[PDB]
Every structure is written in structure tokens, then in C-alpha cells.
Design a protein around this ligand. Structure first.
Ligand SMILES: CCOc1ccc2cc(-c3nn(C[C@H](C(C)C)N(C)C)c4ncnc(N)c34)ccc2c1
Length: 460
């Protein structure tokens, strides 16, 4: 009688890893409506509150409505997962659209920040705090150029513990309010994060920066920042005054979301403004660096998952092969692949039996052999996993290219230091690894070299 997610929805495709879980594009089996489902693994994420409190929050968020906040439609739960079913948005992340623009002025910044403050104000009225507000939580509603910003992930932080794994942690330290670090926080922390994002939109650099996560956290905690850089000369006084008010240390003296909406800067500039060319270049650099460290971490992770899943799948099938001749049929292959999912959460794309039948067919319709006869599972295993190895190898490659804006084919030692600082790989550890692959003292690596470093940084 309790509703089953897969009874209602089929998976179309994965949309990536978000905070607390993967997101999958799904479709209602009856009505045909498309949805973006965030699937949270119960094993991998400790809850902060009881079930009663989670349920009550979900019920509230189902009834909330605001143009700058993601719409939530449905909530499911079974033995291992939460399924959070929201509206699909196709505009991508705000910053990925900002990097691909000729001009960007304070008028562009003010319109974006007004949308963010508007969504935030509304949620604070409803006593919902974000805590983790950052640029990848700002999606554009569509590919249209006038598109509304939809803030994602309101509600989650209250109920779920943040990951301390670096794959999940990257990019977060720049944005977290000081009082979150120390444990006594309330809705003002969201003004702080919004202040950091605005600082970044108008200069291209984080106001609190450092060589690794803990050095960023130290800057945040002392709370000092300056507008002394060159690009701050191209910016109105009123913009810096707002930022000062939003990055006020003691939360009770910090400006509220609502009072920020009535600020001179927002009033004036969301109604003869020079472009901010110097900020577009730095944000393009900043985004590129952030995106490649993520891809570096996700690539290392999927290689670790592959090692785990390759050995496990082989063992499962050996048990199944009773006669010991290596011959299993598609139905057994499906049963073996299902069992791998029975004890693993990395394929949130494999939501049910029919997602797995199709995925076996795809592997099978590559290995060439017939799916109505018996099969050599050894072969099947070696192709199934690579459809994540090659798949992930290609996603790293693209971010390497994206990062290499001069198409030089290479990343300097200085740039590696920056990528590995953001990735929290120890300086001595990656230099050590660099030495084992770059024996010419070029002080630069090409893609395959950079890839070899990462395999050596995840025990290969
Ligand atoms: C209470 C929070 O419940 C939800 C439900 C669905 C969610 C869906 C997304 C989401 N994530 N993504 C993919 C994004 C990015 C590619 C835009 N990242 C996380 C891989 C989306 N793309 C389009 N529309 C969406 N709604 C999303 C993010 C947070 C969500 C939170």
C-alpha cells in the first residue's frame, strides 16, 4: 500500500552527482511528465533528525511556491533510499552560462543577486535555511537568455549530515559562513554565502582564498577580506557597501535577505554601465579550475568503484556457474548484475529490474554474441564496467580541454599546484607522483600524463 518509486517512474538518464546523492532524469509511466529525482543513499548519509521531522519538512516544501526555488512534487522512501522528485531545469549552472558571455556588468550581477535574495527571503519566511548556498546550487530554468535562476537544495542540510569525503566537499569552503563552522547558525548564514557569490561575480575571485580547504576555512573564520584588487576600481561604491553588510561577521548585525532587496545597489541597478571584462576572465579561470578538480576526483572515484565492482561481479557469477564451464544465460547475467546492485549503491541509474535488463542488453549488443543463447560471463564483465571507465575517462578529458583555454595541450606545474590544492591532494604527494611520470623536468604534463598521475593517486 506504501507507494513504490519505480512503480511510478522510469529512469531516462543520469544528470550527475549532487549534494547527498545522484540526480536522475525520470519520467512518469502514466502521464509522461519528466522529473529530476535526487536519490539519497541511506547507508552513505546519516540523518540529523527523526523520520517524523523529515516527513513534516517534505510536506511543507511540497506546498511552497516561488519562481527562484526548485519545485518539489513527490517524496518516496524504501529500505535503502530517499527519492526527492522535483521539476527538471535545462539551463545548466549559473556560472557555466556566465563564462560564455562577451559582456557582464553590475546590472547583470544585480539581476542575478535579486533573484537569489528573492528566493532566499521567501524561504526564510517559511523558516527553511539552506546552509550550503553556492554557485552550483543556482540553476537556470531554461537555455533561454532571460531565464530565471532556480535555487536547489533548500531543506537538505537541516536533515542530513554533510559529507567529509573530498569528492563531495570540493568547492564548499569558499561559501560557508563563519558561524556554521562553530555550530551556532541561523538564516543569516545564507546572506553570508550570497555575499561571497556576489563578491565573486564582481571580481572573479573568492574573497576568502587559500592553497587548500583548511587554509580557506582559516580565512573565513578570521573573516577579513579586502576590495584592494585592481578590478574593484571598476565597481560602484554601493555594491561594495552591500557586500560589506552581507559579509558582516556577527550574524545579528548582518543584513537580512529582505533588507538586502531594498539596498541602494539592488534598487539602482535592477531598473551606461561598463562591462566587467576583468571579472569575466577570472570567473572563467575560477570555474575551469573548479570543474577540473571535480572531474579529477570523480575519475579517481569511479576507478576505485570499478576495481570494487569488477572483482565482485566476477565472484557473483562464479558462484552462479554451478557446472563450472563459464556458461551463463542472459537471465543469469541479469540475476548476477541484480545481485551486484543488491549490495552496492553506485548505480542509482539501475533503479529496478528493467533498468538492468536493458543495461545487460546494451553490454551484450556490443560484445556481439547472441542474447538468446548461453554466454561467457568473463567477457561480459570486462565490457560492462568499461562503460563507466571509458565513460568517466572521457568526462575527465573534456574538463582537461576546457581548462586548457590556449589549446596548448599542456598544464603547467603552477596550474597543477592550483588544481591539486582545490582537490586537497597533498603537495608532497602529487609532486612525488609527478616525478614518477614526468622525468624530463618539462614542468608541464599533457592529458595522458595528467591521467597517469591520477591513477597513481588512487593506488594504480
Ligand atoms: C529537497 C531537495 O529535493 C531535490 C529534488 C530534486 C533535485 C534535483 C536537482 C538537480 N540536479 N541536477 C543536475 C545538476 C546539474 C547538471 C544541473 N548536478 C547536480 C548534476 C538537475 N538538473 C536539472 N534539474 C534539476 N532539478 C536538477 C538538484 C536538487 C534537487 C533536490
Amino acid at each position: 500500500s506504501t507507494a513504490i518509486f519505480s512503480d511510478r517512474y522510469k529512469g531516462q538518464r543520469v544528470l550527475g552527482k549532487g549534494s547527498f546523492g545522484e540526480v536522475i532524469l525520470c519520467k512518469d509511466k502514466i502521464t509522461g511528465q519528466e522529473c529530476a529525482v535526487k536519490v539519497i543513499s541511506k547507508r552513505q548519509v546519516k540523518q540529523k533528525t527523526d523520520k517524523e521531522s523529515l516527513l513534516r519538512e517534505v510536506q511543507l516544501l511540497k506546498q511552497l511556491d516561488h519562481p527562484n526555488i526548485m519545485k518539489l512534487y513527490e517524496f518516496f522512501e524504501d529500505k535503502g533510499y530517499f527519492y526527492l522528485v522535483g521539476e527538471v531545469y535545462t539551463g545548466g549552472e549559473l556560472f557555466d552560462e556566465i563564462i560564455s558571455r562577451k559582456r557582464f556588468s553590475e546590472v547583470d550581477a544585480a539581476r542575478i543577486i535579486r533573484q537569489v535574495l528573492s528566493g532566499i527571503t521567501y524561504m526564510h519566511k517559511n523558516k527553511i535555511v539552506h546552509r550550503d548556498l553556492k554557485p552550483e546550487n543556482l540553476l537556470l530554468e531554461s537555455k533561454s537568455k532571460d531565464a530565471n535562476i532556480r535555487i536547489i537544495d533548500f531543506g537538505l542540510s537541516t536533515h542530513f549530515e554533510a559529507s567529509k569525503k573530498m569528492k563531495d566537499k570540493i568547492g564548499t569552503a569558499y561559501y560557508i559562513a563563519p558561524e556554521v563552522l562553530h555550530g551556532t547558525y541561523d538564516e543569516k548564514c545564507d546572506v553570508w554565502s550570497t555575499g561571497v557569490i556576489l563578491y565573486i561575480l564582481l571580481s572573479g575571485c573568492p574573497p576568502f582564498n587559500g592553497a587548500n580547504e583548511y587554509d580557506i576555512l582559516k580565512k573565513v573564520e578570521k573573516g577579513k577580506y579586502t576590495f584592494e584588487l585592481p578590478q574593484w576600481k571598476k565597481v560602484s561604491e554601493s555594491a561594495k557597501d552591500l557586500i560589506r553588510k552581507m559579509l558582516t561577521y556577527v550574524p545579528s548585525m548582518r543584513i537580512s535577505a529582505r533588507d538586502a532587496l531594498d539596498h541602494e545597489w539592488i534598487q539602482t541597478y535592477t531598473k551606461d554601465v561598463p562591462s566587467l571584462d576583468n571579472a569575466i576572465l577570472n570567473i572563467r579561470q575560477f570555474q575551469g579550475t573548479q570543474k577540473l578538480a571535480q572531474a579529477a576526483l570523480l575519475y579517481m572515484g569511479s576507478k576505485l568503484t570499478s576495481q570494487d565492482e569488477t572483482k565482485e561481479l566476477t565472484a557473483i557469477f562464479h558462484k552462479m556457474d554451478k557446472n563450472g564451464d563459464g556458461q551463463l544465460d542472459r537471465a543469469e547475467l541479469i540475476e548476477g548484475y541484480k545481485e551486484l546492485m543488491r549490495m552496492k549503491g553506485q548505480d542509482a541509474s539501475m533503479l529496478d529490474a528493467s533498468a538492468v535488463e536493458h543495461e545487460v542488453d546494451q553490454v551484450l549488443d556490443a560484445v556481439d554474441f547472441d542474447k538468446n543463447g548461453y554466454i561467457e560471463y568473463s567477457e561480459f564483465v570486462t565490457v560492462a564496467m568499461d562503460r563507466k571507465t571509458l565513460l568517466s575517462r572521457e568526462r575527465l578529458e573534456r574538463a582537461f580541454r576546457m581548462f586548457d583555454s590556449d589549446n596548448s595541450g599542456k598544464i603547467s606545474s603552477t596550474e597543477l599546484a592550483t588544481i591539486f590544492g582545490v582537490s586537497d591532494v597533498d603537495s608532497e604527494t602529487w609532486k612525488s607522483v609527478l616525478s614518477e611520470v614526468d622525468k624530463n623536468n618539462d614542468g608541464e604534463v599533457d592529458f595522458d600524463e595528467f591521467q597517469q598521475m591520477l591513477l597513481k593517486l588512487c593506488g594504480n
